[PDB]
Design a protein around this ligand. Structure first.
Ligand SMILES: *C\C=C(C)/C=C/C=C(C)/C=C/C1=C(C)CCCC1(C)C
Ligand SMILES: CCCCCCCCCCCCCCCC
Ligand SMILES: CCCCCCCCCCCCCCCC
Ligand SMILES: CCCCCCCCCCCCCCCC
Ligand SMILES: CCCCCCCCCCCCCCCC
Ligand SMILES: CCCCCCCCC
Ligand SMILES: CCCCCCCCC
Ligand SMILES: CCCCCCCCC
Ligand SMILES: CCCCCCCCC
Ligand SMILES: CCCCCCCCC
Ligand SMILES: [Ca+2]
Ligand SMILES: [Cl-]
Ligand SMILES: [Cl-]
Ligand SMILES: [Cl-]
Ligand code: NA
Length: 241
């Protein structure tokens, strides 16, 4: 694979996992330090949710870097590498990102339940795809998972957007900016998966790891940066519980 075998264990992709680890750690510490000087009760909720996003990713990236939770899946002759921690990361962090958006929109607990439920299904069916031993199964689970993603994105772009709008221009502008980012960035994930080692195998494990790393840092640190510098986080929130 494209990269450099940093730890001398036959894995060129550790170059990208190592860089990922550092950027996630730096992002976590940045938000944490900025968080310390925040007193508004609403701002503090946004900081708490948002710090955990690169924080959990940091742990997953460190694990993958050291080769913890790495295994092989047989698809005929081919043995595919699967990093379990990638999926565990996404399981925890995608709901947290959706919670940030739901707090801005100030939607009800049932709406939030639906959003995070379909999101969880997206990730789980992604994992089933990655562990499947035939081509037909892998592509089928990918498609099912992609339909779940579209449902999530549709809810953001319609129901949550309309709710955010009535909270006035500050909240609405921040919501719209973040949703514009999400609609593009999240859609890149299924594309990379199907052209990479898990799908068609046009791109190898090296390039794939690199590009997931860029997506992850943008979707987590980039998202957090835009959110936490907005005045909208001072506005009233109502957590689902
Ligand atoms: C780390 C932060 C984010 C926002 C990660 C997002 C990941 C996805 C949107 C993954 C989606 C997938 C789909 C739709 C199809 C199967 C494979 C994936 C799990 C990568
Ligand atoms: C309170 C407003 C939101 C409640 C919406 C009720 C309908 C629920 C739709 C469920 C969609 C799940 C998709 C499963 C994967 C395709
Ligand atoms: C109102 C529409 C809501 C649902 C949108 C889901 C599809 C997202 C399309 C964005 C495609 C970006 C491709 C970027 C890859 C380089
Ligand atoms: C033999 C040593 C090869 C070293 C290759 C270094 C290439 C540059 C790496 C930059 C990775 C992109 C970081 C993106 C940050 C979001
Ligand atoms: C003024 C802020 C300085 C410290 C910010 C730390 C963030 C480190 C992560 C690298 C940023 C990549 C995010 C991509 C932005 C689109
Ligand atoms: C042979 C040493 C390679 C070290 C890679 C550093 C990457 C800088 C971003
Ligand atoms: C744990 C962090 C690993 C640092 C490696 C950085 C490679 C450029
Ligand atoms: C305060 C830093 C965030 C920690 C997130 C949880 C990962 C450690 C087990
Ligand atoms: C919670 C972070 C996991 C990092 C594992 C380190 C293992 C050292 C060999
Ligand atoms: C072939 C395996 C079928 C999976 C379909 C997922 C809905
Ligand atoms: Ca307030
Ligand atoms: Cl404050
Ligand atoms: Cl307050
Ligand atoms: Cl490669
Ligand atoms: Na290595």
């Amino acid at each position: 694979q494209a990269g450099y075998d940093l730890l001398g264990d036959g894995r060129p992709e550790t170059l990208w996992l190592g860089i990922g680890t550092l950027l996630m750690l730096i992002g976590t510490f940045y938000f944490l330090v900025r968080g310390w000087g925040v007193t508004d009760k609403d701002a503090r909720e946004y900081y708490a949710v948002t710090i955990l996003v690169p924080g959990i990713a940091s742990a997953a990236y460190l694990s993958m870097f050291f080769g913890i939770g790495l295994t092989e899946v047989t698809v005929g002759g081919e043995m595919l590498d699967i990093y379990y921690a990638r999926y565990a990361d996404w399981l925890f962090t995608t709901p947290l990102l959706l919670l940030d958006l739901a707090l801005l929109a100030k939607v009800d607990r049932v709406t939030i339940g639906t959003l995070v439920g379909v999101d969880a299904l997206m990730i789980v069916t992604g994992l089933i795809g990655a562990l499947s031993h035939t081509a037909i199964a892998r592509y089928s689970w990918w498609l099912f998972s992609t339909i779940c993603m579209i449902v999530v994105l549709y809810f953001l772009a319609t129901s949550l957007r309309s709710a955010a709008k009535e909270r006035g221009p500050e909240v609405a502008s921040t919501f719209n900016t973040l949703t514009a980012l999400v609609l593009v960035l999240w859609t890149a994930y299924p594309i990379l998966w199907i052209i990479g080692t898990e799908g068609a195998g046009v791109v190898g494990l090296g390039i794939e790891t690199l590009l997931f790393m860029v997506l992850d840092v943008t979707a987590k640190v980039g998202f957090g940066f835009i959110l936490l510098r907005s005045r909208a986080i001072l506005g009233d929130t109502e957590a689902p519980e």
